[PDB]
Amino acid sequence: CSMVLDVAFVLEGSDKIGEADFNRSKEFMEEVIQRMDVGQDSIHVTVLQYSYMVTVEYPFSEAQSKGDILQRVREIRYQGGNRTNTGLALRYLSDHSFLVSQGDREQAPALVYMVTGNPASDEIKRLPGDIQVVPIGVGPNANVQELERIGWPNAPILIQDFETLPREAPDLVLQRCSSGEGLE
Ligand code: NA
Numbered sequence: 001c002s003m004v005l006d007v008a009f010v011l012e013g014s015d016k017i018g019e020a021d022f023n024r025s026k027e028f029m030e031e032v033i034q035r036m037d038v039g040q041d042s043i044h045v046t047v048l049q050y051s052y053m054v055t056v057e058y059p060f061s062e063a064q065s066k067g068d069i070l071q072r073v074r075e076i077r078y079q080g081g082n083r084t085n086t087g088l089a090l091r092y093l094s095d096h097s098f099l100v101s102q103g104d105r106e107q108a109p110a111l112v113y114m115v116t117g118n119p120a121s122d123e124i125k126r127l128p129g130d131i132q133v134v135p136i137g138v139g140p141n142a143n144v145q146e147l148e149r150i151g152w153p154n155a156p157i158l159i160q161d162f163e164t165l166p167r168e169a170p171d172l173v174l175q176r177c178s179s180g181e182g183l184e
Helices: 019-035 066-074 086-097 144-151 165-179
Strands: 005-012 043-050 054-058 110-116 131-138 157-159
Touching: 005 019, 005 086, 019 066, 019 110, 019 165, 043 066, 043 086, 054 066, 054 086, 086 110, 086 131, 110 165, 131 144, 131 165, 157 165
Parallel strands: 005 043, 005 110, 110 131, 131 157
Antiparallel strands: 043 054
8 A cells, every 4th residue: 555645543452352462453553554655755654542541652743654653563552441432532533633733634535444342332423524444343242333333434344353363454454545445
């Protein structure tokens, strides 16, 4: 995927996920970033982790080089929170992450890949249309119809388990990046 695009990665880091599965989420994300054409004139990346609260791990406003991003990703510490506040994570995206004051490019399309394995603890609201969300529902505990509503027009990418996530999902994520649409 090589284009002008602002991409957000949102990882659930709750106790229900656990440290091992969160590390698998991280490794999935690292692999995607490696395959993407990340640079100042191309793809820009922001990274968020959420559970009880939301942490901006890497804002758009910081240096948009692959090396700097990937190293910050390695430095991300699993929070292990007692909630899955997906609605709050979405609010961060619309009301913080994709603002020009936080490094967002006004003329670039906005795309979010959100990795979750549990139903939302909180109230969810569909984002403004300009922020495209591709939910990645991992494991048997994902609330699929909830993700379908968050995702529209994007179908959720459903992954059987966190072990499969780093192996299977990057290909699908990059296909969606380049084409602008999911498969079949
Ligand atoms: Na944008």
